[model samples]
Structure formats: C-alpha cells, structure tokens
Target: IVGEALEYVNIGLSHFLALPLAQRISLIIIIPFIYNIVWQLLYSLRKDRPPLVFYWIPWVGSAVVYGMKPYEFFEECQKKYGDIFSFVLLGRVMTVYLGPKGHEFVFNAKLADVSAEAAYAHLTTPVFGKGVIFDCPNSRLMEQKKFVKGALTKEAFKSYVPLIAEEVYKYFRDSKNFRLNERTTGTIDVMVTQPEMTIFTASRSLLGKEMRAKLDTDFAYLYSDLDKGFTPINFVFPNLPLEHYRKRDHAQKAISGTYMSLIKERRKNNDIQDRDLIDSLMKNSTYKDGVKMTDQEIANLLIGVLMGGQHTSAATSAWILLHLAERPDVQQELYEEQMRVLDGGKKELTYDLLQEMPLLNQTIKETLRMHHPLHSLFRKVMKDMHVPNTSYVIPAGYHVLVSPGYTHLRDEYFPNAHQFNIHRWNNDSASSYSVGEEVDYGFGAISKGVSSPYLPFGGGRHRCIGEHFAYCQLGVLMSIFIRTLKWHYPEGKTVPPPDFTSMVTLPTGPAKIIWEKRNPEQKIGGRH
Candidate 1:
C-alpha cells in the first residue's frame, strides 16, 4: 500500500511540475489558503470543543494582535465569543477563560492535570538559573517558598521597616534626584527612581546590609540586564542569539556567584543568624524528602525571591507616585493621615505604625488593583480536562491562560474601574472575598479559591508569598515620602498611559514628577 501511494504521489508531482511557473506558484499559495480555512471550519464545527478563533495564517495566528495589546484583544474577543474561546497564538492553542470563574478554572486546577512550571520554566530557568523556581519540581518549589517565608514574618518585618525607612532616607540624601541638603526642590522620573528604591530597600531589609551596599556600584546594572531578559520576545523564544540574552546569562552567573561567595563566608565563620533571607534559607532549606538544597541552589533561590518582588513593587510604587502627583489632594490627605498617625512626625515609622494609616495602606491596595504587575498567568495542560459546567474538553498539551488583571478592570465588578479612585475600597466589601476556605499548599495557610475579582498577588498554590513584605516596604517608603517631600507632574502633564510591552505593566516613558522638600532640615529618618 505504501509503494502504491508513493507511485501515485510521484505521478501527481510530475504532472504538477509540468505546469507553467505562475500556475504552480498560484497553486502552492491557494492550496494552503484553502486547507487552512477548511481546517478552522472543521475545528469550529466540533460540538465538544470550544470555539476556535478564525485566522488567515496557519501557525502565526493572533500573535501580533495578542502580543501588542492583550487586554484590548481579550475584550474584543469576549464581546463576540462570550467568556471562553480558543485562539491560536503562534503555533499554540491557548484556551483563555475570562472573569472570576476563569480565574478559578486556571489557578485552582489540579496539579495532576495542569503545570505552571511546564508553562514558565523555559522563560524563567535561564534568567533565574537552574534548580530553583520553575526549574525544579513542584514539590521542591513549594518547600522553597516555605523556607523563604520564615524571613517574611512579622518579627522580621518589624526590623525591616526601620531598615527600609533608612534606605529610602539615604537614597534621598545621596541620589541626584533629591539632594536634601543641597537643594529643596527637584524633579525625578519615578520609573528610574522607584526600581532603584525598591531594590535598595528590599536588599537592605531582606538580604542584609552588605548586599544592599553592593548595589551602590555598577553591580546594580546587572539586575537591569537580567530584567531585560523577561520581555515577550524572551517568553516566545527562550534562547536567541541576541545581545540581551548574552547579557542575561552573564548577569545571572555574576549575581549567583556573588550570593554564593557570601554564603561561603557565612558558613566559614558560623555567622548564620536570622539576619536576612540568605541566612534563613541557609539554616532551613532541607526538603522533607531528606534532600538538602545545595549552596548554588540557595543562591539561585535568593535571586528568584528578590526578582519576583522587585519588578512588582517597583511598578506599583511608580504608579502610586504618578497618581499622587496627579492628585495632590490625596497626597495632602496622606500626609495629614501620617501626621495624625505618627504624632506629628515625632514617632518614627514602624511596621505596626504603618498599619495604622488606613488611607496609606488603601492607596497601595488601590494602586495594585489598577496596575497588577502580571497581566496574564499560564498553565500547560498535562491531561485532558473538562471545563466545568460546559461540554468543552481541553486536550492534553494545549495551554490555558487566565487574566485576573482583566477581571479587575471590568465595570461590573468595579464601577468605573478605569478611574483611579482610592475611595472605592472604603466599602470593605469592594476588595474582599469569602475565598471559600483556607488550605495549606506546602508553604502556609491561604485562601483556597480564586473567585475574587481582585487578585493582584494572585491566588491558590502559586500565589506570591511577599504580600505582607510588599505592604511593609511600600508603606514605609510612601510614609517617608509624604513627610519629607511634595511632588506633582510637570506643568501641563498628567499620568502617563501604561506601557504593556514588558512582562510587568509600567507607566510609559517620561513618567516624571516635580517636587520640593516639605522640611529639609528635619532629617527625616536619614543620617543627614
């Protein structure tokens, strides 16, 4: 049968080759065009499967539209296709389930049937290094989260608050953006300042003073280079012959080696204390399976933990500053609240005191709602699974995507969600969800379900473990800013539109704010 089919194919090929050149070229183009349409037509006709979005191209379908403006694309499709539909992005069949139900579908799926690591390992392993985060097994990742959680405790945060406050004050004193003693007023681009501020404070609080000190030099640029490796291009093509990819590998090695050297010296001197995440992990990173994490793995895990919160807090703080710059009334209210809470700046900012300023904490919450760092979260289907309350069965190997960030912007859940109104959260129920019940996913107890419309730090097993620390870090930073300086957008400027080109959402270029010191002589929490 094979020989007979080959003979017929040869005869047909010979006949086709005898045709005129233009005719042959036209046939080649038309054949695939017809086949592609027919394939989609047949796919749409299947009753058991969800609708397949139509496309002209075969493999490269929807990549351009989805990549450039994903939320807009999602909104456009949701209007025509309701909540669930499958679109072809590049060669993958991505089944996107929108809204809170969709959030539950993707985030709360069983580990046997879905794998986040499979979906993200390609993009994360090179940047985060091996044997950590998505590079390791799921069980190991969970244990790693548990190990790092020890450093993010309330006791640790109490110490972190003062250190973070000092770092912020130190940055203001030395940074060219705000030379407190040298000048009373200045302008700064928050996009530049916030990332630097986040790393400095987080390092000082979470990695010990020595690591924070290293950031003073060009060594900080290593993080910037590592960050560039997380763009959409890197997501699609994990390895490319590009300068940024080379820089990413180099930065990972240099950063990891730096951590390893620190770990070695600490071990040599038996200097392990509950000083920071490094020491915390060094003391208790042994897995329950009787396997101990190697020194290199500990270094890599430190990079992952720091990088995870770095981009998120940086973007959130930037957005908060821009919004406050646009709304000075809110800024003044924040300042007044701080004054009231801190007894007229006489009392130093502390973790417990930061909790007292309702508006300040609400401002952080509102900022996160408006600008969730991750726009999309993904999981690769490991086994055939049925969409709940539907006839659709997502076949094994297809990817599933959910965007709680998209849900956060809907008017149904949040009235006039586009407007950045901090007062919306005052209702208490505005951002709260029953969250069903608490379940421990190896790390600690957290709300099990993902039915909530507001999930800035995500939910379920893979939910971020840095929530409290972020609030602590941002609250202290903003508290000091409110007391020390006042700022607004440059003349005739408003908050910039969000730039979605990178992995995290950030304000577009020139996100600048003009400022003047409220009291330059007071020495607001710094060594000046």
Candidate 2:
C-alpha cells in the first residue's frame, strides 16, 4: 500500500529497533555526540562571540579542569586564547576576562547591565538566610552594608583591639593545644585553631559578650555545620537533598534564634549602648526608602557579615602563621618592631598602636597579595555587553567573571611574585597601584574603577567593608602571637601548597605549626 521509498524507510526502522539494547543505546549516544560537535563547530564560526574553550562533553564542559585549579586553567587558556574566552560550566555559560583591564570591565560594569545578586544569591541565600545580603535587592544590600559599617568604625575598632587581644590570650591559656599553665611548648593545627580564634574574637567584638560566651557550648558546633554549607558543590548546585544541606538549614535557624532572643532581651531591659554591632544596628538599620529591617532580618545580616569575614579571615590567619613558621627572620623582625613600638612589650595593644607597626601591616599585605581568599569573582550579564575596544559582544543571560587574584601573582605586576618577601611592599613601585576614581555607592565612598593589579579586598560597590577590621583583628592577633610564642614547621616540613577545593583558598591538610614560649619564665597573666 506504500510507495517504494516509504516501504524502505519502514523496513529500516524495524531492523534498527530489532537490534540488541546495548547496540541501540550505543547508536543513541553517537547521535548526540555528533550533534554536540556540529553545534560547537557552528558556534566557533560566529565572529560576534568570544572564543569558546573546546570540550568533548556537552553540559559537563570545562568543569573538572576549571574547578580543580582555576588559576592554572586560566594560565593555559591565556596562552592559547589570550585574556578573554567563554566556557560552559554545568550548562552555564561563563565569559572570563583576565588581568587588570578585565577587572575594570567586570567590577565597574554598569549595575543595570550586570547583577551580582543574581549570580551569588543562590549560593549565599541558603547560608545567610533570606532578607539579607544577596537574598535582597541591590539597593537594600547597599544599605545593609552601610548599617554593618556603622559598627566597624574607628571608635568601635579602638574598643575591639583589647577585646580581641583578650580573646587570643584566653584561647592560648585555656586551649588544650597551648595550655600555658602546663605545657610551655606545643604544636597546634592552625586550620583548627584559627577559625575558633577568629569566631571568638569577632563575636566578642561585634556581637557583644553574651554571644561570645555561647561559643563555649554546642553553639560552636552549629557554626561548623553552617560553614560546611559553602563547599564548591553547593556553588554548583545550591539546594541538593543532602545531609549537609539539612544540617546547614538547622544551624541557620538555631543561630538566628540565638541572635533574636538576645535582641529581645536587650530590648526588654533597655540596655543598648555604643558597644558592639548589635547595639549599632539597633540604633541605625532603617533605610532611606522608609523601610526598617526586622529584628529577624538583622539577625540574618549578622550571619551574613560575620560569615563573610569568618572564612577569609580564618584562612588568612592560618596562612600568616604558616608563612611565619618558615621565616624566622621575619618573625624576629616583627617581634622587634613590637618591642620598639610597645616599649619592650610594656604598652597594651591599642588600635592606634597597631598603626605604628609598618612591618607587621606589610606582612599582612604581602600575604594577602600571595593568597587571595577568593580566586574568582562573578556577576551575571543582564544586557548584551560589548568588550571595550574588542569586536566581541557578550550576550545577555551569560555570566562574566574576573580574577584580580591571578593578576596579583603575575611577574609583570610583581617582580618576584611567588616569594613571600614583605620587604617588596616597601618599594612604592612594587606596592602601589591605581585604585582609579573614588565614588560612593550608598554604603560609602569606594574605588569607582577596578584597574588595580592587587585587590585583596576587591573593588567597586561590592568592595569589602571589613577591610579595616581585618587589619585590626589580624594585627592584634599576630602581635599577641609574636609576643607570646615562637613557632616553625616541625623538623623538615615547609609550608603546604594551597588546597582550592573549599570556598576559600586554604593550605592543604596538616597545616601544623610547632611552637615554644619566647620567655618561658615570664608570667603568662600580664597584659602585653
């Protein structure tokens, strides 16, 4: 009943369907393989788009390589494709712009054209909760940053130094690692100690006394569970049905309740003071748009800002210790600076005193330059963006990424970029780079351009407001360690290479530092 060609097609379909299941499946896979290759070939022929990195896998493109060691991947790609290229990561298209010029393009891009919130909201919202940070609109986030910044001022920072120093001393005295009362010399894993130390000091200084006290209980465990929420897999897939996500959710609620009850208690007693972040936010969390943040929202913001600094500060603190372990001469230099500035460790550490120790500050700077906590920063393209002075146009619905972290490690910007020489910062040419123009983005005046090669704190509107606080906290912590302990890598071990699997770049496991009392006979209770 059918024509000759129709009968042939019907017979061929029957013959193919009659094949074994394995062979049929193989033929099915081969169909998509050819289709994917042809699609990429057609994409490559387009002159309007940037070069796409070649990958055999369709949706799982460039993920394993890029996720493993981003900087190294960037370097190899740069050698082949120059400073700009596009790659697919788990079905998402990301266009990367490298170097300082790229920093300018991405960080300082027009707000209407790019959205930071859209890119990071999925990642940060679950950990920080709703109604704060990237969970909210850009304007609200700007105001939230302003509110948190109110508590981190010079006056508050002046009060924070002594509190931070006390926290450090108490940890050393009580911790099983140091136990100054019993063991004079001991080793502790900085990966373990620094996070605990950071949380204690930050909570004590910002959240007030009661919150700091709670850290001594199971509450600290909750924070550990919360921190586990920031893994790379979470970045790729925000809400997976998994144990880690469930624990993260539980931790968020428990921590939020802890903050809220504390707020209510302070309100009931009318005990607000110009003391900490809680007090500051209590006074000034109202936005110019006639909206005030709820106490619950305030609690969420506390988590956002605290967790924001927690990971980066903790990792930096650990790196500083490990670096100092390898460089005894630098440690001695820092100790000498302390002696000279503090009048033989007689003067108590104050915020103003920390400013006088240039080498100490320079050491922090050099370390930041070497190991930027965040290797990549991202924003979602909202409009078709033309690459300045290039033929390419990045389409909307794509993501743009930049890495000042990589630029920081280049020999063009830094002569001996890999070496941990704090002395290099002393040279104006080596240390100083353009921050471009300054303008306010609601929170405060920040660099309006991102042309700098060294941006440890980043740039533009989303630049870190915790920059000053990090310096103060690290300065106090390091000064105390220098005065109290002398440490190095045990036996023949040196510093470990960075492990990039986490949200932040951290040193690989066994980040241990051996230590001994600088003056074992000296009384441990005195204020230094």
Candidate 1 structure lDDT? 0.88
lDDT of 2 by residue, 498-523 (tens): 88778899889778999999888755
Candidate 1 lDDT over 387-505, as tens digits, reads 97899999999999999889889999999999988888774522234446888899998888888899887888898888888999989999989998899988899988787777789
Q: Give me the overall lDDT of model 2.
A: 0.89
